[PDB]
From a paper:
AMPA-type ionotropic glutamate receptors (AMPARs) are integral to fast excitatory synaptic transmission and have vital roles in synaptic plasticity, motor coordination, learning and memory. AMPARs are tetrameric assemblies composed of subunits GluA1 to GluA4 and exhibit a modular architecture comprising three layers: the extracellular N-terminal domain (ATD), the extracellular ligand-binding domain (LBD) and the transmembrane domain (TMD). Here, to determine the subunit composition, physiological architecture and gating mechanisms of CP-AMPARs, we visualize these receptors, immunoaffinity purified from rat cerebella, and resolve their structures using cryo-electron microscopy (cryo-EM). Our results indicate that the predominant assembly consists of GluA1 and GluA4 subunits, with the GluA4 subunit occupying the B and D positions, and auxiliary subunits, including transmembrane AMPAR regulatory proteins (TARPs) located at the B′ and D′ positions, and cornichon homologues (CNIHs) or TARPs located at the A′ and C′ positions.
Residue numbers in the entry:
A (entry chain B), C (entry chain D): 2 to 379
B (entry chain H): 260 to 480
D (entry chain G): 426 to 480
E (entry chain G): 315 to 370
The structure:
């Protein structure tokens, strides 16, 4: 007696218009499926689009969705709201499928869709034989990359000039670039947000370091979403990573459906999807797969009676939450970002990424990084 | 041209009867009328010779006379949330919003069956009976406010800061469209935004101040 | 018995919205003037925007305006239309007020408002002690600058690499810049059209020659109308010329009206006026001044019997046209470009320009060039 | 160009259309059909107008 | 032809009724359009009636 309509929650933050569009498109494609086996049920999203994720509106949204009887919550977080959301989801046995930045110690009902950028960066650094470079980073996605870089520098005797550019303006960027050029530092690794990375690239072009002799390694999951035309014209080395393969039948089918979408009804469809929207689509597919698998095991998920006050004196968790977590961690599907499979800690495994280098014609695939095969060049 | 004034959203039961706009802009003299039950939120309406409001922590719509001071109809909105479960973005027990347009009396609420999305309903001005319901695809808890011009529901995106008309739903064709129509939130937090067809104007409550917007409408031939 | 309405002609070119807007604004300001001495008559413009089909369209427009009984024609020309228009204006004794590129051969019934750019360029190239540089030019405005540069190089022993970039594309621009940098050429003089100059600057920023150590001299009459933003941050040496002084009471008096104009009624008013628009305004003021002077000379202007076909078998020049040309060459007014005064060849005489240089804060006035005082620095 | 004779005003617009056959000799507006009859390089063509009213 | 004269002609009875003169109007390629072709006078109709566009 599986329910005909399962209720999921959704927690979206500022500057998440295209990801919400991908979520709604995936909901549309799942609900209106001509196949009777792809959709044995319906997905009911209880959506909260907050503007400031400050651990108080996040808590209010989580409690409002918990009172509605949701089973799993597709949530996005930042550095100021990851801990509260993860603790609330782990305490009440409510699954949290998140496409945001992965963290450590985030087991117990948290499933992260974003692959870690730790092994690929080190496998690109040691292959390029870099022993003295600059690391322009920010702390909006944790400290894992910086800690790994410092550990590798200590274990290999490198010279990493680590600079935090969280509170750096444009003229400060120009002064920093000139100062680094004075010390003959021509090898850089940039790990910042998308807007910060674009501002850094614009300042680099404006001050004039986009010419031959300068090497930049972009620590990002999407390399085709950043404009590097003037870097192509200048001839500087630019190396980056890509997660979604645009020459994949599933991805091309999504692109065909995406270019046929109306911008007035699906905002953010005027541009090709980023890796965040791809992770959102894969997360919705993973939720559909685990709900179908729960239907296969004849588990009647029902939060009747358990719904109530989030901050109750006796912490009463969902009795079937552990089954949902196990079924969510036992999935193995193929989708936009390739193979989606999770370990017992809720982190993605056997994920394949493509390393791209900037040449005169443009971006050029030079190899692939696999979780079990490290870096393999063509 | 008598304006109607209400303060608070939890337990107040006093309404004000400033008889004129000049008696409301400058004159601080008013008549205080009591209600049989206090209202919830800032979503009420004054239509014809009565006032439609919500009854405390319930999904009950009450029609009250402002001249004879009695109750004629008190019904329950079908499958409507109450007591801060399907409120606006600003909260304040604004689970049910009542408005009027050139076609009549409309109620914007949310339904558990329709997730938490905005559901529109046309109400009988006399019997308070459901005439027709429309399903929209915009969640109510992230709306902040909404208003109907004539058969079209326009939904805002926020309540303090950058506020704009974000969603539009045509019930005649039952079609939705995301538009970008900025409006200036001068006094930060907004609480109520309703439409008056006689003045063709938006009445708004901005952080304890009473504000008016004059709208612009276009028709394609 | 001067006529209350004087008919003038206007011939306009493709991409002349702003200059036509300035012409219409000057007509408005002259016609509806509170002073009865500033407007003792009414200017009636017969305007033709032809989108030139060369000499055929120019002759058709000239004949159409000549049949209407115009006294003077305010027309523009290009390299394909200067000769026919000047010959038609000189043969039929019709004055031609032109803010287009100056010439030398035409010496009758032609008044050119644009000052020559050869003297200031030569003074700047000899005060900077340049002896080996690259001259990127185009032939859309004549051969006077190239001839003067080659003559000065022959008389002084300079090394000028002259390149015509009329048929050059962006890729060819990048190859030419890379080849010139390979030969250690870092001193450039650019004499091109506005769009061509902007494309050249964009290509220069693309290849990365806007860094310090590269010097560019812009042979343009408007320096503040060029988007030079990346050159400020890069530190490249940019030197240019400006004709209209924005800190002049007449210019700011015009700018007060210009910012108060309506875009939907005066198109092209969304941007500050260029030097061409300022020259158009000064030309309308010159026409008003010479018509007032003809009124003061008790000369009854009329074209009652001369209105007809241009290509008649006997040439029928206007009898009073020589009076109009003599009165036109004797004007000396103060306007947007400063002192407007002409010699007996109808060329600009006694004009002052400001030589600006690009610094870290923006364009800085370095000196001023006068016709008789040469280059004077501050 | 647009001229309103009721208010005697003028406004520079930029509404674009398409000269499919690269020459237009006649172009007139017909009330009953609310359409623009046009003569395009020896061919007979029609355009459809889009009138809007502001309130 | 070669005059600023507006003529009304019947397409049913095939006769003439009115031949008026457009006051202060150009003719014979005096004030034509950009394409020329003796288009000095343009007659049209709208919901308010009959209008003539010319030049003076
Ligand atoms: C790594 O992940 C991949 C997912 O693509 C696994 O490859 C699949 O393995 C199953 C067996 O478990 C096969 O039936 C599939 O055909 C494989 N997919 C292919 C070859 O495309 C792989 O087994 C995983 N490795 C480990 C050690 O877990
Ligand atoms: C607004 O109220 C007035 C009266 O308060 C309504 O007038 C009634 O009209 C019906 C039929 O039109 C009559 O049978 C009633 O007797 C009228 N009322 C009175 C008190 O005489 C009017 O219809 C209302 N407006 C709407 C749109 O319903
Ligand atoms: C508004 O949406 C809700 C939910 O999508 C609709 O409720 C469903 O209606 C269909 C009939 O079309 C039933 O088959 C489902 O069982 C209903 N769902 C639930 C949870 O009861 C509702 O009918 C819609 N209202 C309108 C007027 O279309
Ligand atoms: C060059 O222009 C200046 C004005 O900028 C002329 O100086 C004027 O000379 C006349 C006499 O002809 C005086 O009446 C004015 O008062 C002067 N104006 C000044 C000094 O600002 C100068 O004569 C011009 N030179 C030539 C050769 O034409
Ligand atoms: C809008 C449309 O699709 N068609 C219109 C219609 O009026 C008709 O087919 C034609 C002739 O008047 O004009 C066009
Ligand atoms: C429909 O579902 C069946 C079983 O789930 C599957 O074998 C088939 O490939 C599906 N077809 C499509 C078009 O999705
Ligand atoms: C840029 O990459 C090429 C190989 O593609 C390499 O030979 C060169 O040394 C690199 N330059 C720098 C500055 O790292
Ligand atoms: C705006 O609407 C109000 C409503 O009465 C009124 O002052 C007037 O119609 C408008 N005021 C304006 C346009 O200044
Ligand atoms: C208008 O300006 C002219 C020229 O400066 C002057 O002669 C005249 O006296 C002025 N008229 C008035 C009314 O100021
Ligand atoms: C750049 O310009 C400055 C100021 O005129 C000058 O001192 C310097 O020598 C110039 N440098 C080059 C390389 O032309
Ligand atoms: Ca409202
Ligand atoms: Ca016509």
């Amino acid at each position: 007696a599986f329910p005909s309509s399962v209720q999921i929650g959704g927690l979206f933050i500022r500057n998440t218009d295209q990801e919400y569009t991908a979520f709604r498109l995936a909901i549309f494609l799942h609900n209106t499926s001509p196949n009777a086996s792809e959709a044995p049920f319906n997905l009911v999203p209880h959506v909260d689009n907050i503007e400031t994720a400050n651990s108080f509106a996040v808590t209010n949204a989580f409690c409002s969705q918990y009172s509605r009887g949701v089973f799993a919550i597709f949530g996005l977080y930042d550095k100021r709201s990851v801990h509260t959301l993860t603790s609330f989801c782990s305490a009440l046995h409510i699954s949290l499928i998140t496409p945001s930045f992965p963290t450590e110690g985030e087991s117990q009902f948290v499933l992260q869709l974003r692959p870690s950028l730790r092994g690929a960066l080190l496998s690109l650094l040691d292959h390029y034989e870099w022993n003295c470079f600059v690391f322009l980073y920010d702390t909006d996605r944790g400290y894992s990359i910086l800690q790994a870089i410092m550990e590798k520098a200590g274990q290999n005797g490198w010279h990493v000039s680590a600079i935090c550019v969280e509170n750096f303006n444009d003229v400060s960027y120009r002064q920093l670039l000139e100062e680094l050029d004075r010390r003959q530092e021509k090898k850089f690794v940039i790990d910042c947000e998308i807007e910060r990375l674009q501002n850094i690239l614009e300042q680099i072009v404006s001050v004039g370091k986009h010419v031959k002799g300068y090497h930049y390694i972009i620590a990002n999951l999407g390399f085709k979403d950043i404009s590097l035309e003037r870097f192509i014209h200048g001839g500087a080395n630019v190396t980056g990573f890509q997660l979604v393969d645009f020459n994949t039948p599933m991805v091309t089918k999504l692109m065909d459906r995406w270019k046929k979408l109306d911008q007035r009804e699906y905002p953010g469809s005027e541009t090709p999807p980023k890796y965040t929207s791809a992770l959102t689509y894969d997360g919705v597919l993973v939720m559909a797969e685990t709900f179908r698998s729960l239907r296969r095991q004849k588990i009647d998920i029902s939060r009747r009676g358990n719904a109530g006050d989030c901050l109750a004196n006796p912490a009463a968790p969902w009795g079937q939450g552990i089954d949902m977590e196990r079924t969510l961690k036992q999935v193995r599907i193929q989708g936009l970002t390739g193979n989606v499979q999770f370990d017992h800690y809720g982190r993605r495994v056997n994920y394949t990424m493509d390393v791209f280098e900037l040449k005169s014609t443009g971006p050029r695939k030079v190899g692939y990084w696999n979780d079990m095969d490290k870096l393999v060049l063509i | 041209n008598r304006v109607w004034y209400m303060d608070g959203y939890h337990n107040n039961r006093f309404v004000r009867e400033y008889k004129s706009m000049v008696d409301f802009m400058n004159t601080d003299n008013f008549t205080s009328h009591r209600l049989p039950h206090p209202w919830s939120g800032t979503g009420q309406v004054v239509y014809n010779g009565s006032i439609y409001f919500n009854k405390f922590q319930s999904h009950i719509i009450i029609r009250f006379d402002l001249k004879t001071e009695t109750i004629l109809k008190t019904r329950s909105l079908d499958y409507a949330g109450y007591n801060n479960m399907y409120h606006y973005a600003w909260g304040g027990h604004s689970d049910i919003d009542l408005m009027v347009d050139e076609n009549g009396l409309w109620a914007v609420y949310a339904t558990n069956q329709n997730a938490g999305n905005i559901v529109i309903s046309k109400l009988d001005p006399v019997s308070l009976q459901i005439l027709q319901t429309w399903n929209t695809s915009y969640p109510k808890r992230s709306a902040g406010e909404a208003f109907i011009i004539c058969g079209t529901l326009y939904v805002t995106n926020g309540y303090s800061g950058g506020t704009k008309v974000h969603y539009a739903y045509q019930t005649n064709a039952s079609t939705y469209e995301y538009i970008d129509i900025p409006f200036q939130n001068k006094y930060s937090h907004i609480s109520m935004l309703d439409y008056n067809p006689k003045d063709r104007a938006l009445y708004a409550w901005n952080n304890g101040h009473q504000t008016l917007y004059n709208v612009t409408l276009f028709h394609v031939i």
